[PDB]
């Protein structure tokens, strides 16, 4: 597929921004787990997931499960300063992990970050964040896809007016962005692992252990 | 449940 | 102010050096890392823009990146021992097995790249400025590595196809070097609870911010 | 601090 295909069929293939209902985390745990179905039916409408065997598909939403729900978050919570829209009727105000989703939406908010972005780093995600952890192949299909999204995020800055050096830094600021992303999930399915945890939320977390 | 879906 | 060329010569300067096994097996790696901690404080010194941030930025950096900066280190010298870790020369090894894997899994990576040592230093350098930069300066510092990586990669005769691709799978690699922090301390805190194995004094000031 | 100490 093309580049400007890519960004079309992940724009529309986005789950929609669903609505709220211990009662606080009772009503993230409830928020998140109708969010995971329509993730799960978003992930096989990524261009090259289907094409992973199943049980690679169910490792990727495994480990990158929260990342998705967080970056979600963060991008939804972008023109909302000092606040975090988990729903539209449900946004919450100023506990570390709370700061860091705040800091990284700040930083998305300081950066611009545009919707045709946030699609390519949510499917990056996606492939990556359990690409590492004989099939080889499959591997080196998430690579060429990841080198695919790779150029079409080159494509988008390129195409605004970016210079080849504003290119390389914004695409460097980005990457970086979900470094902390992981450390939010991992920090976050720490505190989640310590409110009734829904059947399908339970498995989530049972892949962390 | 994940491999269900 | 530096150049490109400038800053790579002056990270493989400051490179730390390659310590052995005082020679349980997490009693040598505690004995190990802690030895290598005080290496790496005195290269992070080092690291072009780092003392120039306020003292107490620096302990920051250092307190949420050490085990990262460890790791990328560890998984840089198992490069040519697939299947293996080299964490000492003298010692090679074959609830932590999970963790094993996923360094055993990023060398291999790191191997299949073919990482550069010039490229290794900037990643490293990366890591001590950004794992902790969210909780204008370094952001800037960030780019100049950013910059010096695609020098490096533009001198080796890369395509700017192939710049952006390799530089993308490149700091891909750190959100699977901050996810084996992250699960890595996790172990570490409990080994303490657990009274297995005693911390050093330093290591136990690096756990107790996290 | 340690850390502060060795810097
Ligand atoms: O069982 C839970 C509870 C909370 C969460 C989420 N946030 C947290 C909060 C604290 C710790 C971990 C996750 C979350 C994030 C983004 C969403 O779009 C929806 C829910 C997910 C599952
Ligand atoms: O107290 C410890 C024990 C082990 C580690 C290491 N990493 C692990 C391994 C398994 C679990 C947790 C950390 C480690 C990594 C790289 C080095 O150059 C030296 C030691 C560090 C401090």
């Known amino acids: 597929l093309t580049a400007d295909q890519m960004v079309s069929a992940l724009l529309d293939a986005e ?3 669903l609505y709220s209902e211990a009662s606080m985390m009772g009503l993230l745990t409830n928020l998140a787990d109708r969010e995971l179905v329509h993730m799960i039916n978003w992930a096989k409408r990524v261009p090259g997931f289907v094409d992973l065997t199943l049980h690679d598909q169910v490792h990727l939403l495994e480990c990158a499960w929260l990342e998705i729900l ?3 978050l963060v991008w939804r919570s972008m023109e909302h300063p000092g606040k975090l829209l988990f729903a539209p009727n ?3 105000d100023r506990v570390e992990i709370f700061d860091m989703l705040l800091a990284t939406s700040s930083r998305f908010r300081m950066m611009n970050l545009q919707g045709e972005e946030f699609v390519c780093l949510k499917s990056i995600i996606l492939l990556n964040s359990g690409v590492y952890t004989k099939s080889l192949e ?3 299909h998430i690579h060429r896809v ?3 999204i790779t150029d079409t995020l080159i494509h988008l800055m390129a195409k605004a ?3 080849l050096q504003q290119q390389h830094q914004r695409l460097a ?3 970086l962005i979900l470094s902390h992303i992981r450390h939010m999930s991992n920090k976050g399915m720490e505190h989640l692992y310590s409110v009734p945890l829904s059947d399908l939320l339970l498995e989530m977390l049972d892949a962390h252990r | ?3 269900r879906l």
């Open chain 2, 1 to 3: 449940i994940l491999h």
């Open chain 1, 146 to 148: 990841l080198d695919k």
């Open chain 1, 138 to 140: 499959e591997k080196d």
């Open chain 1, 70 to 72: 967080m970056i979600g």
């Open chain 1, 161 to 163: 007016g970016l210079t």
């Open chain 1, 15 to 17: 789950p929609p921004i």
């Open chain 1, 90 to 92: 449900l946004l919450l």
């Open chain 1, 173 to 175: 600021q980005l990457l």
